[model samples]
Target: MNITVETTVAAPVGKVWRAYTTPEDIKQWNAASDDWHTTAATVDLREGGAFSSRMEAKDGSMGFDFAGTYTKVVENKRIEYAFGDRTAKVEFLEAPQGVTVRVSFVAETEYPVEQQQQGWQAILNNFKRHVESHLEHHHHHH
Candidate 1:
C-alpha cells in the first residue's frame, strides 16, 4: 500500500529544498508533534549516502532512530529512500506562485497507513509554518 500527501508552501524551491536537506533546519520541524523532538539529524544528501534523525519524547518516555540511505537524489527536484519497512519519495515542484512538495510512502502492511500518513502530513505542515514564520520575522526587521 502507498499513501501520498501534497502541499504548496509559499517559499522558493531552493529554500524548501535547503530546509529539507539541512540538518539544522530539519531538526527544527521534523518531529511527529510537539511532544516529540528531533534531537539530532545527519544528512549526506547524495545518492547512496546515509541520512538519519533521532526523535525522542519530551518526557523521556520513548525514543527511536529513523535512518536511511538515499536511493535517488535529483538536486532540488526529488529524493527517494528506503527506510525501515518502507520506501519513501519526496518531490519538489515549482508551482504557479509557490513550491509544491509531494510525499509518498510505500509499505507492505495496511495496518499503520493512516497513522503514518498523519505523522508525515503533520511534519510537512510544521515545515510550512516554520518557514513562513521565519521569513515573516526576518522581513519585519529588514
Candidate 2:
C-alpha cells in the first residue's frame, strides 16, 4: 500500500527544492517531533545517487539510519527513490499560496497507515516551518 502526505510551504519552489535536497537544511527540518532530530544527512542529488539521514532521540536513547538510492530526479519538481524493498515518490507543485510538497511511500507492514501518515505529515510540517522562516530571515541579513 502507498501512503501519502503533503504540506504547502509558503516559499518559492526553487527554495523549497533546495531546502529539501540540501543536506544542511535537511538536518535542520527533517525531524518529526521536537524530541527527535536529524543529526546528520547526506545527499547526492541525481539518478542512482545515494542519500541518507541519521535520526536520533534527544536523550541519546535510540536512533536509526535511513538510506536510499535515487531512481529518478527532476530539478525542482520530482524525486523517486528506493530503500530496501520499498519506494517513495515526492512531487513539488507551485500553487498560489506556496509550493506544495507531496510524498507517497510504500507502507511498511509493521505500522498502521494512520501512524505512518502522521509521522511523515509532521515532518513535512516541520519542513514548511523551516523554509518559511528562512524566507522571513532573508529579508534582513545579519
Candidate 3:
C-alpha cells in the first residue's frame, strides 16, 4: 500500500528545504498528535546515509524510533529513502501557489492503511505550520 500527503508552505523554497531536512526543524514539527511528539531527530542528508526520529507518547505510554537509510537525494528538491522493506519519497516543489512539500510512503501492516495515512498527513501538516510560523517570527524578529 502507498499513501501521499502534501501542503503548500508560504515560505521560500530554501526555508522549506531546511525545515524539512534539518533535525532541529524536524523535532519541532514531527508528530501525529499532541500526545505524541518527536523527542529527537538526526539527519544525514546524502544518499546511503541514515536518518532517525525518536517519537514518544507524552503520557509515558510508549515510544519508538523511526529510522531509514537514504536511497536518493536532490538538494532542495527530492529525497527517497528506505526503511527495512518500505520506501518513501519526499518532494519539494516551487510553484505559483506556494512552495509545496509532499510525502509519499509505502504502508505497513501493523495498523490500518487509513491510520498510517492520517498519522503521516498530520505530521506533514505540522511541518507546514511550523515553517509558516517560523517565517512570521523571522519577519518580526530578524
Candidate 4:
C-alpha cells in the first residue's frame, strides 16, 4: 500500500524545491515533532545519487538514518527515490497561493497506515512552516 501526504507552502516552486533538496535546509525542517530532529543531512540531488539524513531524538534516546538513492529528479517539479524495499515520489505543483508538495510512499508493515500518514504529514507541515517563515524573513529585510 502507498500512503500520501501533502502541504501547500506559501513560497515559490524554486524556494520549495531548493529547501527540499538542500542538505542544510533539510536538516532544519525535516523533523515530525519538536522532540525529534535531523542532526545531519546530505543530498547528491541527481539520478542514481544517494541522500541521507541522520534523525535523532532531542534527549539522545535513539536515532536512525533515512537514506535513499534517487531514481528520478526533475528540478522544480518532481523527485522519486527508493529506500530499502520502499519507493517514494515527491511532486511539486504551482498553486494559486504558492506551491503544493505532495509525497507518496510505499507503506511499511511495521506501522499502521494512518500513523504513517500522520508522521509524514507532520514533517511536511514543518517543511511548509519553515519555508513560509523564511520567506517572511526575507521580505522583512527588503
Candidate 1: where is the Cα deviation over 4 Å?
A: 108-110, 136-142
What lDDT tens digits, residue by residue, belong to model 1 across residues 3-110? 898788998888888888999988898887899899899989889998899988898888899898899998889999888767889998789978889998885564
lDDT of each: 0.85, 0.89, 0.87, 0.90
Please give, for residues 1-142, the per-residue lDDT of candidate 4 as tens digits. Answer: 8887999998999889998999999999878888899989998999999999988989888778999999999989999999877899999978999898999999977778898999999999899999988775545567
Q: Please provide TM-scores, in order, for all candidate models, with all chains considered together.
A: 0.90, 0.92, 0.90, 0.93
lDDT of 3 by residue, 35-108 (tens): 88899999998888999999898989888898999999888889899987799999987888788888898887
CA lDDT for candidate 3: 0.87
Best by lDDT: 4
Which structure is stronger by lDDT: 1 or 2? 2
**Prediction 2 global C-alpha lDDT:** 0.89
- Pairs in steric clash, model 1: none
| Clash pairs for candidate 3 | none
Cα-based lDDT at residue 11, candidate 3: 89
Q: Point out where model 3 deviates above 4 Å.
A: 137-141
Worst 10 residues of 4 by lDDT: 133-142
lDDT of 3 at 1: 70
